[PDB]
Structures are given as C-alpha cells and as structure tokens.
Design a protein around this ligand. Structure first.
Ligand SMILES: *[C@@H]1O[C@H](CO)[C@@H](O[C@@H]2O[C@H](CO)[C@@H](O[C@@H]3O[C@H](CO[C@H]4O[C@H](CO)[C@@H](O)[C@H](O)[C@@H]4O)[C@@H](O)[C@H](O[C@H]4O[C@H](CO)[C@@H](O)[C@H](O)[C@@H]4O)[C@@H]3O)[C@H](O)[C@H]2NC(C)=O)[C@H](O)[C@H]1NC(C)=O
Ligand SMILES: *[C@@H]1O[C@H](CO)[C@@H](O[C@@H]2O[C@H](CO)[C@@H](O)[C@H](O)[C@H]2NC(C)=O)[C@H](O)[C@H]1NC(C)=O
Ligand SMILES: *[C@@H]1O[C@H](CO)[C@@H](O)[C@H](O)[C@H]1NC(C)=O
Ligand SMILES: *[C@@H]1O[C@H](CO)[C@@H](O)[C@H](O)[C@H]1NC(C)=O
Ligand SMILES: *[C@@H]1O[C@H](CO)[C@@H](O)[C@H](O)[C@H]1NC(C)=O
Lengths: 422, 101, 51
C-alpha cells in the first residue's frame, strides 16, 4: 500500500515550542519511516492540528476537517471534555480513536472504536490498595486535586468496607499551589500516610510547601499516583529519610528502551527550562511516552493488513469507513513490547488492564526499585534491603511448661462439673 | 434559526452542545446537573437544577443534626462521587466515619 | 565539632539524629549559620521537635 495518513489533534501552546505529545507523535512517525524493518514498503505521514483543549466545538471541527481530507486514525485530543466529543465522531464514522489520556468513561457508553494506552485507574487503584496493606497502614489521608479525582480512586474509596483503613479524603486548594493552609490542617491530625493524586507538576508544587512546612521527616510516607516520579528532582529530599513510594511504567532498565530517551532529549535539545519548579530534565513524561507507544501499536495493525486506502469521509454525510470493523480488531487484539512493557487491551473495553509496573521508592542512594506489581500476580517485592542486612531479633517466651502429672486423690483428682472442660 | 436550546440532559451530550452554543452565541439552558470541568472557559449557559454543591451542605447539616457517627453513603454510578464530594470530605473536620459502597 | 572548613556537615547531622539530640546550641558565625541550616533542612531535622 501507500502513504496511510494518520491524524493528530494537539494543544495550543501559543508561541512556544510544540507540545510534548506532539513531538512524541512526530518522533515516532519519523522513526518508523526511517526504520525499514518495521513497515517496509509503506511510508507514514502525519497530520497534526491545534485546539484549545477546552472548546469541543473546535475539537469537533478539526476532527471533521481531518476526516474530510482523510485520516487512518485519531491520536486523541488528550483532554476529558474534548476527547468525548471526538470519540462520538470517530465511532459514528468508523475510524478508530487511539487515546493516551485518561478520560471519564460514562457507564452507558455503548462505544467500541477507541483504545486508551493510558493504564486505567481501576487497575491502578487496586495497586495502591495493595501497597497500603503491604505497609500495614490503618490511617491514610488521600489527597486529590480536582473533582474528577474521586472517580480515579473509587476503588480506593470503597476499600474500608472490607478492611481497616480509615480514609480522611482531602482536596487541595483550587488552582493555586499555596497548600499551606491544607498542610497546617494535616499536621494537627497526625496524618502520616498521605496518598497524593496530583500530576507531576503539582507533585513538585506540594513538596516545596511540604518541606517548608516541617513535614519531611522519617515519620511521613508519601505515595503518589503519578507515573512520573522518576522525572522529579529529589536532591533536596534524598537525605531527609522520607518515604516517597510510587509507580513508574517507563522501563528505563532496558538498553533499547533507554537509548530512545537520550535520543529523545537529543531531538528535544531545548527542554524549556524552569529551575525553580523542582523538576529535572524532561526525561520523556508518560503523556509523551505513551504516544511513542501509540504509533507502534497502530504500526502492527497496518503491518498485518495491507488493504487500507484512506478515503474522504464527510461529517454531515456520515457513512462508516470500509474496513473500520476489520482494522479495529487488529488494534484491539494487538500486542507490542514497547516502552511501557507489554501492550494489550481489554477485549470488552480496549482499556489497558494488564500491564507491568515498577514500585520504585526513595532511598538515600536515589530513587530505586523495591518491587514489581502485576495485576495477575500482585506485589513481588524485592524486600531484601542489604544496605543493613541484620534487622531485628525476637524474644523467647512462655513455652507453657508441660507438667507431667498423674491423678491421685486428694492431689490431682477430677472435677464433678456437669459439662465438658478444656 | 433558534433562540434557546433546552438541555439535552446528559453529561456527555450536553458538553458537546455547550461548546457549539458557546461559539454561535445562542444560550443553552440546562435542567440537569452536569460535571462542569474546573476550567471550561464558558459563560453562555445556565443550569436550572439545584446544585449538588449546596445540596451537599444540606445533607451535611442534616446528618450532624441527627448526630450520626457511622454513615454508610451508597452511590449507584461513578459520577455520584462528585455529586457528594462535600460529604466525602466531611471526616476531615468532624467525627463522622464514612464507609462508601 | 563541625568538620574542618567545608560546610558539608551532613556526616555530623547523621550522627545527631541517631542520638535524638533535640536542643542544639550552635556556635558558628552568621556565615556558617546559613551554611548549616541548608544542610539541616535537607536532613530531616527542621521540625517542631528541635530547638
Ligand atoms: C477488563 O479485563 C478484566 C480481566 O480481563 C475483567 O475482569 C476484571 O479484572 C480482574 C480480573 O478478573 C478482577 O479483579 C479482581 O477483583 C476482586 C474483587 O473482589 C470482589 O469484588 C466484588 C465484591 O466487593 C465482587 O462483585 C467481585 O465479583 C469480586 O468477587 C479482587 O479481590 C481480586 O483479588 C485480588 O486483587 C489484587 C490482585 O489483582 C490483590 O489485592 C489480591 O491478590 C486479591 O486477592 C481481583 O483483583 C475484576 O473484578 C474484574 N471485573 C471488573 C468488573 O473489573 C474486566 O471485567 C474487564 N473490564 C473492565 C471494565 O474492567
Ligand atoms: C523509608 O525511608 C527510610 C530512610 O530513607 C528507609 O530506611 C533505610 O533505607 C536504607 C536504604 O538505602 C537502608 O540501607 C537502611 O537500612 C534503612 N533503614 C532502616 C532503619 O530500615 C526505608 O527503607 C524506607 N522504606 C521503604 C518502604 O522504602
Ligand atoms: C528497527 O527495528 C528493528 C527491529 O528490532 C531493529 O533491529 C533495528 O535496530 C531498528 N533500527 C532503528 C534505526 O531503530
Ligand atoms: C516490498 O514491495 C514488494 C513489491 O512492491 C512487496 O511484494 C513486498 O511485500 C514489500 N515488503 C517487504 C519486502 O517487506
Ligand atoms: C518474584 O521474582 C523472583 C525473582 O526471580 C522469583 O521468586 C519469581 O519470579 C517471583 N516470585 C513469585 C512468587 O512469583
């Protein structure tokens, strides 16, 4: 076959560099074009357009604009209000709609032409719930950021109905990162096991207030629900004895996976600096890391199907695309070893509900792995902490002192009690 | 040629019509509660439904009038946690003990 | 005693945490007073448990 045009719908930076996802989409297309091993006698071409991320009318037009000259896929508007509108267009026009950002799934969705490579929180909120029982906690103080955050942790809010957790759900102030009136309230409740649900931006925003507040000791644990703690500056925090345990999915241990990331920062090469944020170098944030995996999953489904000729579909004259149902199953039952582990989809859903997580934590040597989570298996901890191997001792005890004792009257004679005795 | 759109009464569908009514300038009267995202920069719409912001004050004032300690809030859909978000945050200040099913 | 001239007093402050030493009476200058408390904040020791 031929050109096989993809469709991109990205943000509106407005006189800055192009977005991290838009670079990630244009890095993956340019890679697979020059690598003739994957998709040999094809040559992919992108089509990226700009929207406000908050005007679905713009998102609907730029969808029907890209559907007008013809696309083969839509790689997400990456925002909850705009993604739902473009989901309804792509389902009514047949074209798949590959998502990279978590959106709200309404229960009566009745939709099938979408996959989301972002790991779904119903798999994640079990994994946070398995750490809060591995650490044997009883009092946790889950903190979210906006009203959508309760949905993202509904498998953690329902949790005390089966266990001994006593949640104390709190919300950050609206948009300002002055969470000092929150943290003053959290000190006086002796709240020691906070399970923040920020982004990696606001994770740096809290811990500069959380260090200015006297709360970064060895008496505090912090679990984050971001997948980008690895790209977080931890140099003012490493010696504090705090416990920052979180999940990373970007498998930076593998050589082929890591070698992309230096080539990523080579192709980035500017990485718009903000040294007072508390962030490191960009290090391929997970919103961009999944977009590089988004193209490779679609590249498998066109490799096993050289029948796609992209045609010009209308918007007001909607008619399903020719191989829409055929090619969608090639996406939904695909499989690809990408950056973020194995990539599968839920055959009911298209939502990643079986994947691989590193359970990285904060030590004094840096931010290193202490275990590995698996939706099938669970926590396979590497509990060995051989920096100090000898840890504890126990106590020899009661032993009950078995007394060899025969019955003789009046010494050990039986009782005339009218019941069995123990 | 219309003058007033009257509220398609969903959360998914009402958002799509709202951005259209934003652009075309036509008002968009709603009669059903909707999850309004914290920065949808729109004011061309009303929503004549009693907000679950204030309705959750009414529940929280009521459950501490009755001095309950073991409230057992039960919802039916994942949207409903937002509808009761002030009551979920309530154990942060009083001695209530929620248990959500 | 602080280390000789370098303001890397982190091996000192690691020893001071393990002794539960809560009432330190530093005798620096105002230069080295700023030098310690940037290490003393990086070490988890600026709480309400320390004078
Ligand atoms: C997406 O794809 C998956 C699998 O292909 C489908 O199945 C869901 O995912 C897993 C796998 O079956 C299920 O997770 C399990 O849930 C248990 C919940 O216990 C009960 O919960 C309520 C009662 O409160 C009952 O209604 C329900 O039927 C269960 O009996 C967990 O307890 C399970 O055990 C282990 O969980 C983790 C390890 O994963 C650890 O904490 C422990 O080791 C623990 O033993 C297990 O996690 C899940 O329930 C399945 N269903 C749903 C609806 O999510 C999905 O159906 C499919 N689609 C969607 C939308 O997800
Ligand atoms: C919580 O943080 C503390 C301090 O950062 C960790 O305790 C020490 O970790 C180092 C790792 O370099 C070990 O060498 C020490 O032996 C640990 N000290 C003790 C007393 O165990 C601790 O491991 C962290 N907890 C978790 C779950 O990561
Ligand atoms: C292209 O992909 C193949 C498949 O593994 C690999 O062997 C080769 O090194 C890749 N080339 C580039 C330039 O990435
Ligand atoms: C290359 O093109 C030829 C003919 O155009 C085709 O038969 C073949 O499948 C293509 N791909 C390869 C060799 O990977
Ligand atoms: C956890 O990993 C170790 C390392 O090989 C090994 O015991 C096994 O793969 C895992 N354990 C279990 C019980 O599956």
């Amino acid at each position: 076959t031929h050109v096989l045009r993809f469709g991109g719908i990205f943000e509106y930076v407005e006189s800055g560099p192009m977005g991290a996802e838009e670079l990630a989409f244009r890095f993956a297309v340019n890679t697979i074009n020059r690598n003739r091993t994957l998709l040999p006698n094809t040559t992919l071409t992108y089509d990226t357009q700009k929207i406000n991320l908050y005007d679905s009318f713009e998102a609907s037009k730029k969808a029907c604009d890209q559907l007008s000259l013809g696309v083969a896929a839509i790689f997400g508007p990456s925002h909850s209000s705009s993604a739902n509108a473009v989901q309804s267009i792509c389902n009514a026009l047949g074209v798949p709609h590959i998502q990279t950002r978590w959106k709200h799934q309404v229960s009566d969705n009745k939709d099938s032409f979408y996959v989301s490579l972002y790991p779904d929180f119903s798999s994640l909120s079990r994994a946070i719930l398995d750490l809060v029982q591995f650490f044997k906690w009883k009092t946790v103080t889950v903190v979210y950021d906006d009203s959508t955050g309760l949905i993202r942790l509904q498998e953690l809010i329902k949790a005390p109905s089966r266990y001994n957790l006593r949640l104390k759900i709190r919300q950050l102030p609206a948009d300002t990162k002055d969470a000092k009136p929150l943290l003053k309230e959290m000190k006086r409740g002796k709240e020691f096991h906070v399970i923040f649900d920020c982004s990696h931006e606001m994770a740096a925003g809290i811990l500069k207030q959380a260090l200015a507040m006297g709360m970064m000791t060895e008496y505090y644990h912090y679990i984050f629900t971001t997948l980008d703690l690895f790209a977080l500056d931890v140099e003012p925090y490493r010696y504090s004895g705090v416990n920052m345990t979180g999940f990373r999915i970007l498998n930076t241990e593998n050589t082929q996976v890591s070698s992309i990331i230096e080539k990523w920062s080579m192709e980035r090469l500017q990485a718009p600096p903000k040294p007072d944020s508390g962030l490191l170098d960009g290090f391929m944030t997970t919103d961009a890391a999944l977009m590089y995996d988004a193209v490779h999953v679609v590249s498998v489904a066109v490799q096993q199907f050289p029948q796609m000729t992209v045609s010009s579909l209308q918007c007001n004259r909607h008619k399903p695309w020719r191989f829409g149902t055929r090619f969608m199953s090639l996406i939904k039952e695909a499989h690809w070893e990408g950056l973020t582990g194995r990539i599968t989809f839920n055959k009911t859903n298209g939502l990643r509900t079986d994947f691989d997580l590193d359970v990285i934590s904060l030590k004094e040597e840096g931010l290193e792995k202490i275990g590995t989570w698996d939706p099938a298996s669970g926590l396979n901890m590497t509990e060995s902490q051989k920096g100090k191997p000898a840890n504890i001792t126990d106590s020899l005890s009661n032993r009950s002192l078995i007394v060899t004792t025969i019955l003789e009257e009046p010494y050990v004679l039986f009782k005339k009690s009218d019941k069995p005795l123990y």
